Amino acid sequence: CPKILKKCRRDSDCPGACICRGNGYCGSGSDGGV
């Protein structure tokens, strides 16, 4: 489960360290595990 997350309305809203999910928050690439 991702520890760092913030409001986002697109990809640009978050650095390439993660990706903006559908819930409007940053989601870590390895979310499907932690």
UniProtKB/Swiss-Prot annotation:
Signal peptide: none
Lineage: Eukaryota, Viridiplantae, Streptophyta, Embryophyta, Tracheophyta
Protein name: Trypsin inhibitor 2
Cross-link ((2-aminosuccinimidyl)acetic acid (Asp-Gly)): D31-G32
Function: Inhibits trypsin; probably participates in a plant defense mechanism.
Subcellular locations according to the entry: Secreted
Disulfide bonds listed in the record: C1-C18, C8-C20, C14-C26
Organism the protein comes from: Momordica cochinchinensis
Recorded GO CC terms: extracellular region
Site (Reactive bond): K3, I4
